[PDB]
């Protein structure tokens, strides 16, 4: 009691950072978070669908997009925490019978998603350095993420 919350968080963050490479790859890809507990609950506000028009994941996403960051910018509010369904994801629900029918492994489809859902650094035409009196610098656009 009386230890400073912010320095304590910083020390634990340094230690967790040291540990990070010992973690399995997947935990690394999803990420680690290290945060000071703010034990003082001022109030709890619910987002609600009073006639079931919109579901829990919609409501959590709306909270995340429109509400959470404004509330978190109120003075003296140290933390806004969402409690409820999961945030949005693009789910692909594999039919493993069908995947085998085309003689494919789940690994194969996952590789396809990595191949075809990816941003592109499409380049720049006429960028520096260029030789003649090249008139324009044109960046390139190309759809990479779905």
């Amino acid at each position: 009691l009386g230890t400073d919350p912010d320095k304590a968080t910083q020390l634990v963050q340094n230690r967790v950072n040291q540990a990070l490479p010992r973690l399995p790859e997947d935990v690394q890809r999803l990420g680690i978070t290290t945060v000071k507990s703010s034990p003082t609950l001022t109030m709890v506000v619910h987002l609600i669908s009073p006639n079931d028009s919109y579901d829990m994941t919609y409501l959590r996403n709306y909270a995340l997009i429109n509400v959470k960051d404004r509330l978190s910018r109120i003075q003296g509010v140290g933390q806004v925490q969402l409690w409820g369904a999961g945030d949005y994801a693009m789910r692909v629900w594999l039919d493993p019978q069908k995947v085998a029918q085309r003689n494919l492994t789940a690994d194969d489809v996952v590789r396809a998603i990595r191949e075809q859902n990816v941003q592109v650094a499409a380049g720049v035409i006429g960028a520096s350095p260029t030789l003649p009196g090249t008139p324009l610098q044109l960046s390139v656009n190309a759809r990479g993420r779905l």
Binding site: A122, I125, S128, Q137
Partner: protein, 751 residues
């Protein structure tokens, strides 16, 4: 190389060390490499330091002169000579303890404090000398004079703290400036008071000659050399004193008429307060201009470097210009990189240097703008530098229109141009400009995914070919002189300058066949943004504007807020972001700072006078000095900037001091059985001389800041005439009105 200092650093120590280090390093420079100190703004604070130091000496000399003329003893003048430096120099230690600093604001605070410290010394030494002129001895007259003033000295210290320290508790940028002024003055005031109770009376007891004991070494020669002047000034001063006594008697007879004139003048104070246009921090020549070049959208950096070199050469041929510091590719929006834009910082020759009338920062900038107007490959404008690096606009707004509903870059741009399109109607708003640009030319590349995969070509292979050739992948590091340097591969210059160079790039299919992207991709022209700015995690377009400086910001921002509520389409809201968003958060402390400080001064005075009404005799006088100052600035048609406001504050403090001593003197005379009328007149006559001494000291200090043409005398005279009128009014209103208030309040005390 921009060197940036840490908080609580020493600009001067750093600058000297940089110059010494550079001089040491130039000794290793290969022939053909050199250094230049291009911009060294620390010189500014250096001049401010000289400004204080010189102003202090002038002031000390002046007070000595005033003392010699009035008290006609060279020995009396040692009292300010030591007291003033001890107070001012001593202020630095308390300034350190509270973690302040020597900045331009605090130095200005000190120069204003010089007046208060000098007044303190005058009050103590004049009182002792006056008692001596009543035939007392130095030790006995010092005792009596200190019993007369030591209570008022403590009370005035408290009153000055109560006026100034609340100012340090304001919010935001204004608060951060006043904090410097007020803390410096308050410390000096407390220290000077302490000296006023210990060191000044002890000095005057050991140094003032009583009746008898004359000639010693210098007094005899001074009388010999200046006796005619002494006798004449005493004659005219005597005459003025009795006419003033008559005037006080006249006003005290027509006290009701005086009250009427005072109510009129309070009205005039409100009117002139609203007639003089407001200001915040005036425009200072910072010894450079910023010229911006914007070429046609999407132009190449080589085109920009040619425009930038032309601008620089033009500037270098312009008089008063010292250097052209050029950056082709530097964008004003963020100091980030653009192909079609660049900046030349035109550094000017030193202010005292061949800058003359027509050769000034505004003049240089106007000429450069005219000459650059004949550069037709680009839009060029040269602008004056910010007065304080880090805040800009100085009485204007900037806001961010935000795409909160995935409305796209295009619809957000349409919304912002529609907002500018409704707002230039007429709400006093000005030339609202934006920097959000979505019509820089670009190339769109369409990859037929199925067709690529039928040709055996992987879509990742297509994109990787595009990146490495057209976007230049970073591969790994290589070592050179033990240091790492990055190998980067990219298509060569000739092979990427041109849209269909895309089509000649070849990837390979699974079979081993080089498929060209001419067969799997289409390249089309399009338009887009060059810089995407995302504000508060929303893609956002800035618009900035404002009213003229004689209009404030709140009405303008109300206009834009109403217009946006009328004009912004669905899913496109807006936010404020800068000085304006920070102000909107502030609860404008001022509405509690000034009431608190007047209440505090009232209480301090109430304790000193043991009266609930006599404090008014002081407080009711302070509007008049405001009037005196404001009409002064109004008569020069300047603005009420924070510098002139802290000047206004010191003027109210000085007028309060004079009133407090007048009223306390009248009170003790009345306690000696004088009627309020004769008490008021006798007190005013008693205090007339020291008040005149201080006023004359200031006005002679104002005379050199008025006869200084050809030099850096814009702000010198600008505060000069203001101080002349402020002093005239402070003295006139104090001497002609405090007696009137005393009698009015005193005969409205019981029954």
């Amino acid at each position: 190389m921009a060197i940036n200092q840490s908080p609580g650093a020493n600009s001067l120590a750093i600058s000297d060390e940089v110059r010494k280090t550079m001089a040491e390093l130039k000794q290793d420079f290969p022939a053909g490499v050199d250094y230049r100190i291009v911009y060294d703004p620390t010189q500014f604070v250096r001049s401010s330091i000289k400004a204080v130091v010189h102003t202090l000496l002038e002031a000390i000399a002046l007070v000595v002169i005033v003392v010699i003329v009035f008290l006609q003893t060279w020995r009396a003048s040692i009292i300010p000579l030591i007291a003033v430096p001890v107070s001012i120099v001593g202020t630095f230690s308390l300034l350190l303890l509270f973690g302040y600093s020597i900045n331009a604001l605090s130095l200005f605070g000190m120069v204003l404090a010089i007046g208060i410290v000098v007044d303190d010394a005058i009050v103590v030494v004049e009182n002792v000398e006056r008692n001596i002129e009543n035939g007392l001895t130095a030790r006995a007259a010092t005792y009596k004079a200190m019993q007369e003033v030591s209570g008022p000295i403590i009370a005035i210290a408290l009153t000055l703290v109560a006026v100034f320290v609340p100012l340090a508790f304001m919010s935001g940028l204004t608060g951060q400036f006043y904090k410097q002024f007020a803390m410096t003055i308050a410390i000096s005031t407390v220290i000077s008071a302490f000296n006023s109770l210990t060191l000044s009376p002890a000095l005057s007891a050991i140094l003032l000659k009583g009746h008898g004991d004359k000639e010693d070494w210098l007094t005899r020669v001074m009388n010999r050399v200046l006796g005619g002047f002494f006798r004449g000034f005493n004659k005219v001063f005597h005459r003025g004193a009795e006419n003033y006594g008559r005037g006080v008697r006249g006003v005290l007879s027509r006290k009701a008429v005086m009250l009427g004139l005072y109510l009129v003048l309070v009205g005039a104070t409100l009117m002139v307060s609203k007639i003089v246009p407001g200001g915040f921090v005036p425009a200072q020549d910072k010894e450079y201009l910023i010229a911006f070049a914007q070429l046609p959208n999407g132009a190449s950096l080589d085109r920009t470097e040619k425009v930038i070199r032309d601008m620089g050469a033009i500037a270098l041929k312009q008089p008063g210009v010292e250097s052209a510091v050029a950056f082709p590719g530097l964008s004003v929006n963020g100091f980030t990189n653009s192909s079609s834009a660049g900046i030349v910082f035109v550094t000017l020759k030193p202010f005292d240097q061949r800058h003359g009338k027509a050769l000034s920062a505004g003049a240089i900038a106007g000429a450069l703008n005219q000459k650059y107007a004949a550069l037709k490959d680009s839009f060029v404008a040269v602008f004056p530098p910010p007065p304080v690096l880090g805040l800009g606009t100085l009485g204007g707004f900037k806001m961010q229109i935000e795409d909160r509903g995935a409305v796209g870059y295009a619809r957000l741009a349409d919304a912002t141009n529609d907002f500018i399109k409704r707002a230039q109607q007429a709400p006093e708003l000005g030339p609202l400009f934006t920097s959000y640009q979505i019509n820089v030319p670009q190339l769109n590349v369409d990859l037929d995914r199925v067709k690529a995969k039928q040709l055996g070509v992987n879509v990742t292979d297509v994109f990787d070919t595009m990146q490495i050739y057209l976007g230049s992948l970073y591969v790994n590091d290589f070592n050179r002189f033990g240091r790492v340097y990055q190998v980067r591969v990219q298509a060569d210059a000739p092979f990427r300058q041109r849209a269909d160079d895309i089509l000649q790039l070849k990837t390979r299919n699974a079979a081993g066949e080089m498929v060209p992207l001419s067969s799997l991709v289409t390249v089309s022209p399009t338009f887009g943004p060059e810089m995407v700015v995302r504000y508060n995690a929303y893609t956002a377009a800035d618009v900035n504007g404002g009213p003229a400086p004689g209009y404030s910001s709140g009405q303008a921002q109300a206009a834009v807020e109403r217009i946006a509520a009328q004009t912004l389409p669905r899913g496109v809201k807006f936010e404020w972001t800068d000085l304006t968003y920070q102000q909107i958060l502030a609860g404008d402390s001022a509405f509690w700072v000034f009431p608190i400080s007047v209440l505090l001064v009232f209480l301090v005075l109430a304790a000193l006078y043991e009266s609930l009404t006599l404090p008014l005799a002081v407080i009711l006088i302070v509007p008049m000095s405001i009037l005196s100052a404001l009409t002064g600035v109004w008569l020069t048609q300047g603005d009420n900037n924070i510098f002139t406001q802290i000047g206004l504050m010191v003027l109210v403090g000085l007028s309060a001091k004079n009133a407090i001593l007048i009223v306390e003197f009248a009170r003790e005379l009345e306690h000696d059985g004088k009627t309020p009328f004769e008490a008021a007149v006798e007190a005013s006559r008693l205090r007339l001389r020291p008040i005149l001494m201080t006023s004359i000291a200031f006005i002679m200090g104002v005379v050199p800041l008025v006869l200084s043409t050809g030099a850096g005398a814009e702000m010198r005279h600008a505060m000069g005439v203001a101080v002349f009128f402020g002093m005239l009014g402070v003295t006139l209103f104090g001497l002609m009105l405090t007696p009137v208030f005393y009698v009015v309040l005193r005969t409205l005390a019981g029954g």
